[PDB]
Amino acid sequence: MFVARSIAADHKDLIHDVSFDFHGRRMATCSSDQSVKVWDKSESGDWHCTASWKTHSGSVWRVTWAHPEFGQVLASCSFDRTAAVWEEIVQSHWVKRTTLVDSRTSVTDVKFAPKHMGLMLATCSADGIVRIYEAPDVMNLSQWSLQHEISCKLSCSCISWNPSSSRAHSPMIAVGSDDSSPNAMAKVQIFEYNENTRKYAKAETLMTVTDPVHDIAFAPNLGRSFHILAIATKDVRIFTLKPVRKPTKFEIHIVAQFDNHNSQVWRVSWNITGTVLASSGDDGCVRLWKANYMDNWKCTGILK
Amino acid sequence: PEGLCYGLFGDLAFAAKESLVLASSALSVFETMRWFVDTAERYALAGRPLAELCDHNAKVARELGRNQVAQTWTML
Amino acid sequence: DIACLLPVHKSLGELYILNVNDIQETCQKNAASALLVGRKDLVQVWSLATVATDLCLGPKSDPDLETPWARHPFGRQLLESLLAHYCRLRDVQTLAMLCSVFEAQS
């Protein structure tokens, strides 16, 4: 039974994302008033705000941390059609580094690549373009290059990398649509990197999903041989992407379908180890789910 | 309207606007893997014969509360 | 006397014990009997039986609480490999004892 300790953000508008860094002791909150705040943990046991500034000229949708190896780095996307990267310089000096200005309509998601292939960053766009950036000189955070670009021919609203760290899973990305088109076109797609053509290629498409998608999240691997994906369209869903022995061909399966919310599910997350999954619907409650060694997922807690 | 995140210590951060819990939102951290740390500290990996290492690891596993883990060491 | 060729030994058969009241009690005695008979295979398998039946790993009621010991690759797969080995060796003295002990453990 968790204890819900509330903190006063004092944001002048809504809050759109919260993110813990790498160690569970600092969080970053993005709001809709062009501000990003940072909260650190005290030995007393409470969060106090240690930094706040004006980031963009629109509405900040997401803020994500990077690996501590590359430094204390943050990224943010906004309605002003940009994306930024910040670093903390020692008091609380947060300095702007770059401004990725290639977009044309808007940026909805921003995510750092897993920190085993460089300092790479992927940004979505409401027009339907997913762009992947890179920084060959790990230490200059002012030099970012554009390596690939993917056109998915549909509105883009979410993104999530593959954290699998093995030398048997070519890096792959997952994008989610939000188009309320009358036709039942698939709204989740998967792209994978081919080693010999130096180009991202479509791997598989989730045809069974014909409803708008609001969040996409992979599950951390930590030694499994297959992959797990969670989608929050209107009920929480969990898929499986076991491959075939040697693009690559996956055999997709459906493992969960949970209409417990009786509303629209907005965002999801995974615990630390792909054992518990969180959810957040319009009813205002969080819910946790877990497996039972028969692959029979079931609820394991309700939090208000 | 909302945003979620987990943490290394099983802390859940949930933010949602005060129309589902309309121009402001409220958030709280829910203080919902301790065995990992003690298992990492107390284990032994070299400097003793194989039997002594297995016995020590089995004793540590038993004292921590997991017996199905403890008996594997003894069987090995 | 062709007892040198048979897979079953009478001397071991006399000294066995089988107590449902305390399963762990009988396995050490059987291990000692195997030690004093001259078969190291039996001492190893009876040692595994001792360390494989401790009450601490008895099954629970709700499946969601924890995985049963039986699904561990040492409970139902080690036992099923030893059973197949002894069937191939065609030794119905260890088969009956192992089956009886593991069944009465339930």
DSSP labels for A90-116?
---EEEEEEE----SS----EEEPPTT
* B39: contact with C, CB 8 A cutoff: no
Contacts of A168 (CB under 8 A, 6+ apart): none
**C-alpha triplet C35, C7, C75: angle, nearest 5°:** 65
Touching check for B75 and chain C: CB below 8 Å?
yes
Q: Which strands form A110-112's sheet, in the order they lie side by side?
A: A110-112, A120-123, A129-134, A145-151
d(CA A260, CA A287): 9
Q: Which residues contact B51 (CB under 8 A, 6 or more apart)?
A: none
Q: Which two tokens stand for residue A23?
A: 């160690």
Find tokens 């945003």 and name the residue. B3
Cα–Cα distance between A29 and A7 in angstroms, integer? 12
Strand A158-161 to strand A172-176: parallel, antiparallel, or no bridges (unpaired)? antiparallel
Residues of B in contact with C57 (CB under 8 A): 67-68, 71
Task: Answer for the pair A222, A270: CB distance below 8 angstroms, yes or no.
Answer: no
Report how far residue A28's alpha carbon sits from residue A63's, in angstroms, rounded to the nearest whole number. 7
Checking A116-120 for CB contacts under 8 A at 24+ apart, the result is A116/A165, A117/A171, A119/A66, A119/A70, A120/A147
Q: Which residue of A has its CA nearest to C66?
A: A292
How distant is the Cα of B68 from the closest Cα of chain C, in angstroms? 6
Rounded Cα–Cα distance for residues A265 and A235 (Å): 6
Gap between the Cα atoms of C28 and C20, Å rounded: 14
From residue C1, how far is each of A156, C4, C5, C6 by CA, in Å?
86, 8, 9, 10
Between A and C, how many residue pairs show a Cβ–Cβ distance under 8 A?
7
Closest-CA residue of C relative to B65 is C56
Using CB atoms, pick whichever of C66, C67, C74 lies closest to residue B72.
Answer: C74
All residues of chain B having their beta carbon less than 8 Å from the beta carbon of residue C67 are 68
Return the CA Rg of chain B. Answer: 21
Task: Give the CA count within 13 Å in the CB-facing half-sphere of B70.
Answer: 17
The answer to whether the Cβ–Cβ distance between A292 and C71 falls below 8 Å is no
Q: How far is C66 from chain A (nearest CA, A)?
A: 8
Give the C-alpha separation, B1 to C65, whole Å: 35
Experimental method: cryo-EM
Chain A window 280-299: which residues touch C at a Cβ cutoff of 8 Å?
292-294, 298
